Amino acid sequence: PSMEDYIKQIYMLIEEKGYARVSDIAEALAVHPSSVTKMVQKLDKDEYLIYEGLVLTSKGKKIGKRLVYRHELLEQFLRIIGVDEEKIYNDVEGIEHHLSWNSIDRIGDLVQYFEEDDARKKDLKSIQKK
Amino acid sequence: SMEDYIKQIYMLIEEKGYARVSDIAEALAVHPSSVTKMVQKLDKDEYLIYEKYRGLVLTSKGKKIGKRLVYRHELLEQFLRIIGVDEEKIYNDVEGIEHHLSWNSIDRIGDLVQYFEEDDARKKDLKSIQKK
């Protein structure tokens, strides 16, 4: 996992629980608590959080939210265009790490496009016939 | 990487009608010796048929894979252009994601690309949203 994966996961946990425990972060990212500990120190150095209990700072809360928004919007993207639910998670991860923010912005517009008229998704599904 | 070679070999043949080891080394920007190591793997694995002094031909199996690969790359380029991603950001973007998407996703991105190519109004509608 990268720094963004961590901040994202930490924010996800605080969203769901009100706290981000080392053991939960480790468990969620499938890494050892010892690795979480190093990363959490490097994140504290970077002012995303303050570690002693771990606590997101305002920079932490703001960026985490962007990263979750992004992830979920990308998931909605793949769902809307008819990708099989089982592959969606792996595809979104594999590409939030690789696509420019400009490309994300444009994908967001595309999701907006399909939300603006149900006739659009119907027509697209017709193509998925082949 | 076997995949990138098959793709590259495929592209050279589509382009020039033939693919030689040195054509491949210049294309992939790798050392000739690296090409040779991979070509033996490809030949023994029946992806291509190589003869010294003759360059190489893809088997029906290698052609299948090369064609599908180039399709994936080209498609991803067209997808990002169609949705209006900055021209200069496109290459680094496709490169980065092309090895990290289920073929299921690729397939659906293909229908999406088809969808916008079918009708000018759809492109017009999409662009309207980008302008905000």
DSSP labels for A37-100? Answer: HHHHHHHHHTTSEEE--EEE-HHHHHHHHHHHHHHHHHHHHHHHTT--HHHHHHHHHHHHTTS-
Residue pair A10/A25 in contact (Cβ under 8 Å)? The answer is yes
Q: Where are the domains of chain B?
A: 1-69, 70-132
The DSSP bridge partners found for residue A86 are none
Q: Which residues of chain A lie closer than 8 angstroms to B106, CB-CB? A: none
Nearest residue to A77 (alpha-carbon basis) of B123, B71, B121, B83: B83
Q: How far is CA A7 from CA A12, A75, B16, in A?
A: 8, 18, 49
Q: Is B83–A112 a contact, with Cβ atoms under 8 angstroms apart?
A: no
C-alpha triplet B121, B126, B131: angle, nearest 5°: 120
Helix (H) or strand (E) holding B33: helix B32-44
Residue pair A42/A6 in contact (Cβ under 8 Å)? The answer is no
Does the domain made of A68-130 have the CATH classification 1.10.60.10? yes
A and B: number of Cβ contacts within 8 A: 77
Q: Could you write out the three-class secondary structure of B68-122?
A: HHHHHHHHHHHHHHHCCCCHHHHHHHHHHHHCCCCHHHHHHHHHHHHHHHHCHHH
Token pair listed for B35? 């090409």
Distance CA B23, CA B14 (A): 13
Q: Which residues of chain B lie closer than 8 angstroms to A91, CB-CB? A: 100-102, 105
Q: How far is CA B44 from CA A46, A80, A82, B78, in A?
A: 52, 43, 39, 35
**Residue type, position B82, single letter:** I
Given in angstroms, what resolution was this structure solved at? 2.0
How many residues comprise chain B? 132
List the single best residue of B77, B86, B102, B117 to mutate versus A (max A Cβ within 10 A).
B102
Distance CA A35, CA A14 (A): 19
Q: Which residues of chain A lie closer than 8 angstroms to B121, CB-CB? A: none
B79 — phi, psi (to 5°)? -65, -50
CATH class as words, domain B70-132 = mainly alpha
CATH for the B1-69 domain, from 1.10.10.10, 1.10.8.420, 3.40.50.620, 1.10.3720.10: 1.10.10.10
Nearest residue to B13 (alpha-carbon basis) of B59, B79, B75, B74: B59
Distance CA B21, CA A130 (A): 38
Through-space distance between the first and last CA atoms of chain B, rounded to whole angstroms: 41
Strands A49-51, A54-56: pairing kind: antiparallel
Q: CA of A30, closest CA in chain B: separation in Å?
A: 20
Distance CA B22, CA B62 (A): 19
A125 → chain B, closest CA residue: B111
Token pair listed for B54? 């003759």
Of B80, B92, B105, the CB nearest to A83: B105
Q: Identify the sign of the CA torsion A69, A70, A73, A74.
A: negative
Distance CA B102, CA B93 (A): 16
A3 — phi, psi (to 5°)? -60, -40
B50 — phi, psi (to 5°)? -115, 140
Q: Which residues of chain B lie closer than 8 angstroms to A106, CB-CB? A: 80, 83-85, 130
Look at the domain A1-67 and name its fold. Arc Repressor Mutant, subunit A (1.10.10)
Centre a 10 Å sphere on the Cβ of residue A58 and count the other Cβ atoms it contains: 9
Q: Is B93–A106 a contact, with Cβ atoms under 8 angstroms apart?
A: no
C-alpha triplet A40, A43, A45: angle, nearest 5°: 115
Distance CA B93, CA B103 (A): 18
